[PDB]
Amino acid sequence: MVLSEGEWQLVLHVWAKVEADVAGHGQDILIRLFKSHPETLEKFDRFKHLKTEAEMKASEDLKKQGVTVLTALGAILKKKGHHEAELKPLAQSHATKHKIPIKYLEFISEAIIHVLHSRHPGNFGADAQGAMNKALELFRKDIAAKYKELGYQG
Ligand code: HEM
């Protein structure tokens, strides 16, 4: 799949708003993920003991992880589809070291869309959400293709 330039503009226009608060959006997204799909929190050894949302909000490790996730995703989106080199190391560690199924990448995609929609309604109407969903489906499809070359799931 290939996004048109107008779809990329819609994705990078709401992303520039996310980048005004990367740690705050990082937290929101990871907590939304962990609440919605609590099975995903077990993949995180450093903070799978967390029991409540208040403990998640106060964790400095969880916030730092959110910043890591969003900074890497932001570097991939800004490539506008030319992201082959950025995906390689990412696919390798999620498929071989952490073992994250594609399914979980779908779950965090859903968490991203949920939080942008709540925080940025004005910049995240139907067309901007359709373009963000297309940009995350492209990311997932490319990463699933790399998992397959690496010897993992699909
Ligand atoms: C937008 C999708 C995602 C991006 C861009 C992303 C990015 C990263 C990055 C940059 C790192 C640090 C370097 C590395 O280990 O490769 C990381 C580590 C990790 N990621 Fe992801 N990730 C994503 C989704 C997930 C999901 C959905 C899970 C699990 C449910 C997951 C679990 C982990 C784990 C366990 C680590 C290790 C954390 C620690 O250091 O102990 N990732 N991820």
Swiss-Prot record:
Primary location group: cytoplasm
UniProt organism field: Physeter macrocephalus
Residues the entry annotates as binding O2: Q65
Gene giving rise to this polypeptide: MB
SUBUNIT field: Monomeric.
Compartments, record wording: Cytoplasm, Sarcoplasm
Superkingdom of the source species: Eukaryota
Pfam families according to UniProt: Globin (PF00042)
Protein name, per record: Myoglobin
Catalytic activity from the UniProt record: Fe(III)-heme b-[protein] + nitric oxide + H2O = Fe(II)-heme b-[protein] + nitrite + 2 H(+); H2O2 + AH2 = A + 2 H2O
